[PDB]
Amino acid sequence: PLGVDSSLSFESVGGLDNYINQLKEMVMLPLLYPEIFQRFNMQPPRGVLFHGPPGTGKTLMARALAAACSSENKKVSFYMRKGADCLSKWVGEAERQLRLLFEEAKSTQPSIIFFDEIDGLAPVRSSKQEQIHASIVSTLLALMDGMESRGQVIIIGATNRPDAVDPALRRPGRFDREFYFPLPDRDARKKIIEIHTRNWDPPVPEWLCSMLAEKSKGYGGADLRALCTEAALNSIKRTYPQLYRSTKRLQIDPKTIKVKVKDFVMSMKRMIPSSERSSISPSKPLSPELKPLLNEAFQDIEKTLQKLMPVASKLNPLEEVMYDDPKENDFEYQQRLETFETLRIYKPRFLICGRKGLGQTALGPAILQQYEGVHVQSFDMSTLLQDSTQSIETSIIHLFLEVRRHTPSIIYIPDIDNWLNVLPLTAITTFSSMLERLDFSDQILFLALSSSPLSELHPQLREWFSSKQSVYSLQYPTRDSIIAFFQPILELIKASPTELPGGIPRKRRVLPELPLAPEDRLTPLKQLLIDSTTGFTVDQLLHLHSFLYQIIWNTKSEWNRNSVVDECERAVKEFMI
Amino acid sequence: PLGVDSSLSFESVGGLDNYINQLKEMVMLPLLYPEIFQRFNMQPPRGVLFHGPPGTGKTLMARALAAACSSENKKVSFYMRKGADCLSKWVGEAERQLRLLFEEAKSTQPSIIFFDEIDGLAPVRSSKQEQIHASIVSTLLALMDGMESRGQVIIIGATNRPDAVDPALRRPGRFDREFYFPLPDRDARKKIIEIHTRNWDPPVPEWLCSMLAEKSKGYGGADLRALCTEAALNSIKRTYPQLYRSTKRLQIDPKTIKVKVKDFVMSMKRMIPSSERSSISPSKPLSPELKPLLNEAFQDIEKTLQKLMPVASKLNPLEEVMYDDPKENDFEYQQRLETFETLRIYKPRFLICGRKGLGQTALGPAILQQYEGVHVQSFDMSTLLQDSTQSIETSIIHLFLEVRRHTPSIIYIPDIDNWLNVLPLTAITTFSSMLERLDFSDQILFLALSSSPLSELHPQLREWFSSKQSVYSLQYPTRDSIIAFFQPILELIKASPTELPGGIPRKRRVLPELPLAPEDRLTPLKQLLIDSTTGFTVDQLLHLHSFLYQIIWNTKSEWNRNSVVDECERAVKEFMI
């Protein structure tokens, strides 16, 4: 059956190395080196506040910390407190459980305590309720620190939000660490999936990683293990159909090890993402047959993206200090590199103008997918009108405040032709103010999408975007790209009966026992598809593509060729209306 | 490891001298001199209410008061009460803890009690809740004073806000002291940082103070100590890389004392301000290479600032009464100096008109930084639309009321060209009324910024600001200031390979053991940069400055000179479109 483990070698949360060194410098040093705390007479406190996606290192870095320190040294004890679990309606009974737990935590000397659900442990301190909201918060203040020199004990905090509570709970000088979980995307995703998949006596192929790791976006350690279990059970029922209706119990052979990539892709048909349980995010790669239709400008988007903003990230200070320099006295040499790759910028924004039905609003999610690791959100007016409890301008100042409270991050607005007709001049001039409230010298991108083409626009954008390179206009694709797009189906006309299942028999499987345990017109069709379709829009090409898919689906079984051209050609004739 | 101290000689809150003498006159005299309280038969009560930034003398003046009186005389006892810590849902049980604490506080004769979180101790007294909100407030009234001659005991209050509660809690005659904490800016900042840094056996240099003290703005005693610890640990990992992965424990040498200014500036890269945890304040000094482009008028701003308002502050009455005068009977001589430096004023305001892209909205934060110690806020419509629970005009009358409840203080509005299109005539005529609701004879500054130049304006400002010196117009800078600005990079063309890291090798550091414990075209380029750039705007100069930074970044490694002029010159040619 099932079972939980108490040993973790960072094998389901693995990849947060700089976090690991940051916590190692907090928890290892005070009793590893007990001398330099008097050589300098130094304090440094301990305590980390987790925030980010839950289960992406919430329970997983809980096991990574208890397993980390248990694998670190002997002896050491560990404590798990998950929200309100020692409380009452009394103050003086709730708390007497709490500080009996505190005094026994102080009695056991090598000891850490996990505290999760810090909102449930201590909410915001308001006096418009009963005074236990002030009482347990103040008594946790004095009983964690302030009055209480805790000595050798370590207090761990975890939330989903870094600001779900009043900042008195983060007194600066006791809880000076806060860890954000960035949900690793591609490479530590491939690391975390391959450190999972080696727990099987069949080693997995490594062409499927980072193939499956780039398919899997928005997942924790546990649900990627759920992908492991669902592909596993797909191998189970796949290998054996006789898994049903057993009152007389059965026995098995132990040689039931067969693995498919079909198991994984059926798991992808049968999955659901964790972030996409309640969200809608445009995390959509560009369509692979549409790459003949948009790679040619997509390259210009990613190159001019790279030029108008470097996407350069921070290296590890471990290897940086593994390097050494000779000169260390020169703050002028410091302000040199502090000017380097920092003062090279000015106000990241970009605009897309082009016709409707011409590759719109898919390239947006595509260039969202062409690089990751950055923080990003968009001013979707669905996400702006989603609350009415406050003003929408209060929501504007809020969301501008949180994208201010990040890394160099990404801001997007779709459909600005329809937008600015949606909200009044309150929110308009609000936003135009908030455009200028921040500096040029920070790196926040401002992607902008319009479904209307150029030189016809209200000038609100124009005074905002008077740079000649702050915009790009779109054109029709070339005929060679067109015939590149219709190429594969133009040989799928010829490969019906046994290449495709239009004429492939599907046969039955027998049950196991599992014993008892007690050609020539192709070119006039070519001049029908080309040169009579005078460079139209790509959605119309999607119409035709769907239509011919219906044609070849209905005409899926045919031998003795050149008999199935009449259906598609008259469909083109009808399409020209 | 860590540890708290019980002795403070005003070494982390040091600088509030007049506050210290004010509290000394409250707490020392009643038992120092027990005779003059019958010579005059005088009351004077005791009790101070702290308000201001927390941890900037909240916990720090708590330790300064208990350490102050403990270092004052023997014997004396101290009590610490932090919000709701003796309460219940009963009235009669909550209170019986409270006045058992009161009677034991009266039993111990030399005794003071710290009371913090006065909102959590006693909220506003409303009868639209349960009556314990009236009960504990009324019983704290009668049990602190009113009915109870407290005798010899001292009651200390502390909040963040001076008006977080109904003013019945400040009965005039028991709590007649209230201390505001002004967050000392430059000189007591240098005093407070140097009284920290002498706690190390390496004495720090004193060119870095007040250099680092003028870099550090918006910090308490504790987080400046956190700057001490982070520069300390930066020296730790900086001196020693072998601080990792030790199950077999290690031992050290005690000679690990090396200090860098690099440690501090990396701490500045890795810091976060306390006031800037949720705020956005334009506390921004002018850019040092932009000083050739705005010092010439900046001097006029600070001089005419000084003339249109003296910034003269109050001296200490200690040294003032250390001086003596012969004549003390003359209230007419009193109203002389009461007319001196008080009646010399009229209605402080100032206006900035000038073109867009021409030094705007950076000089504002700069002259905010050119002097400090004054109280200041601005009517940012982000900060005006940030709440919708009340009317925005209610917010107007509120904020006018609190800037009325201050020192001679500072009021600013940015972007008045875009403003007055943001709010209706309700808030407009509201504000114009509140312009005239106060007198000429008080000293409140009214800085005003417009991005549009002169002689083109709607006259609402003109009837408000019909003084010929109430406004200043802006011009283009001179060519000598231009070539002064482009001067340093115009020698950074010549100093690539070893002055800059474009051709400097970065080498590796070995691990310690730490043993086991069980030229000629420069002038045509000069006539390309000057005299073909016909006195343009400074943001365009920022474009070019960024562009050439990219040029020299890409061309960073070059010997055998005069080969790298072609890239920048064609960048200028492309820029001229």
Residue numbers in the entry:
A (entry chain F), B (entry chain A): 256 to 773, 1128 to 1186
What does the paper say about this structure?
ATAD2 (also termed ANCCA) is a histone chaperone that has been implicated in nucleosome density regulation by histone H3–H4 loading or removal. Although histone chaperones responsible for nucleosome assembly and disassembly usually do not contain ATPase domains, ATAD2 is unique because it is the only known AAA+ ATPase histone chaperone. Here, we demonstrate ATP-dependent histone H3–H4 deposition onto DNA by Abo1, the fission yeast ortholog of ATAD2, using an in vitro single-molecule imaging technique, the DNA curtain. We solve the cryo-EM structures of Abo1 in three different nucleotide states (apo, ADP, and ATP), revealing a major reorganization of the AAA+ domains from an open spiral to a closed ring—a structural change that can also be recapitulated in real time by high-speed atomic force microscopy (HS-AFM).
To dissect nucleotide-dependent structural changes of Abo1, we next determined the cryo-EM structure of Abo1 in the ADP state to 4.4 Å resolution. We then performed flexible fitting of the ATP-model into the ADP- and apo- cryo-EM maps with MDFF16. Comparison of the ATP-Abo1 Walker B mutant structure with the ADP- and apo-states revealed striking differences in the subunit arrangement, heights and individual subunit conformation, while the structures of the ADP- and apo-states were similar to each other. In the ADP state, the subunits assumed similar heights forming a symmetric planar ring, whereas in the ATP-state, the subunits were staggered in height and shifted towards the center forming an asymmetric spiral with a smaller pore. The most prominent structural change could be observed at the interface of subunits A and F where in the ADP state, these two subunits maintained similar heights with close inter-subunit packing, while in the ATP state, the subunits were staggered in height and separated by ~40 Å. Individual subunits in the ADP state did not show any significant differences in their structures, supporting the idea that ADP-Abo1 is largely symmetric. When comparing the two extreme conformations of subunits (subunit A and subunit F) in the ATP-bound structure with the conformation of the subunit in the ADP-bound structure, we found that the bottom-most subunit in the ATP-bound structure (subunit A) superimposed well with the subunit in the ADP-bound structure, while the top-most subunit (subunit F) diverged significantly from the ADP-conformation. Lastly, but more interestingly, in contrast to the ATP-Abo1 structure, the bromodomain density was stronger and more symmetric in the ADP- and apo- structures. When ATP hydrolysis occurs, Abo1 transitions to a planar ring with a larger pore, potentially allowing for remodeling and/or release of histone H3–H4.
